[PDB]
């Protein structure tokens, strides 16, 4: 009512967060139009 | 308030008292509220 | 292999145009040009199918 408070700077409390994976191991990003995706591994052991 | 220095860090002041004793003083006033924005930034540990 | 992006300014700080973009906008706020074939895509496709059949 008559306190005439003054505001100073406010701390932010930033969260600790860093991928290290998406930026390092997952360079390629692919979106889907289909409802499923297959993956193929070709076993090559030529005799 | 007379000198309009309501906001400051230090305020010297000298004056002499009336009457038979020629008594005069020296005086400095301050209101320090030294603070920090982040209380959790510093990590204090008592070693043992 | 991954498709990687890179950001390029249109002009250099000295004024040299780094990336020239040329097109003909049709209305205010347009950002990308449109090929003239949009209005006739279905006609062309269906006439190709017509000649084939």
The reply to whether residue A13 touches residue B37, judged by beta carbons under 8 angstroms, is: no
Structural resolution in Å: 4.1
Q: Is the dihedral of CA A10, A11, A13, A19 positive or negative?
A: positive
Residues of chain A contacting C5 with CB distance shorter than 8 Å = none
DSSP tag of C14: T
CA distance B29 to B3: 15
Per DSSP bridges, beta strands B11-16 and B24-29 are: antiparallel
Method for structure elucidation = cryo-EM
C18 contacts C12 by C-beta, under 8 angstroms: yes
d(CA B11, CA B32): 12
DSSP B1-47: --SS--S-S-EEEEEE--SSS--EEEEEE-------S-TTTS-----
Handedness of CA C6, C11, C16, C18 (dihedral sign): positive
Q: Is B21 left (phi over 0), alpha (psi -120 to 50) or beta?
A: beta
Q: How far is C2 from chain A (nearest CA, A)?
A: 4
Backbone φ and ψ for A46, nearest 5 degrees, come out as: -80, 125
Q: How many CB pairs under 8 A join A and B?
A: 8
Residue B11, φ and ψ in degrees, nearest 5: -140, 95
CA nearest to A13 within chain B: B38
Residue of A nearest to B39 (CA): A11
């Amino acid at each position: 009512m008559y306190t005439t408070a003054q505001l100073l700077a406010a701390n932010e409390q930033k969260f600790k967060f860093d991928p290290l994976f998406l930026r390092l191991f997952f360079r390629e990003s692919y979106p889907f139009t289909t409802e499923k995706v297959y993956l193929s591994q070709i076993p090559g052991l030529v005799n | 308030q007379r000198e309009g220095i309501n906001a400051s860090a230090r305020y010297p002041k000298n004056w002499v008292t009336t009457g038979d004793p020629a008594r005069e003083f020296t005086m400095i006033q301050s209101a320090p509220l030294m603070l920090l924005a982040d209380p959790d930034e510093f990590v204090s540990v008592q070693l043992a | 292999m991954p498709q990687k992006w890179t950001w390029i300014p249109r002009e250099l700080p000295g004024g040299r145009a780094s990336f020239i973009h040329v097109f003909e906008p049709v209305e205010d706020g347009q950002t990308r040009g449109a090929n003239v074939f949009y209005s006739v895509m279905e006609q062309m496709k269906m006439l190709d199918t017509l000649q084939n059949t």
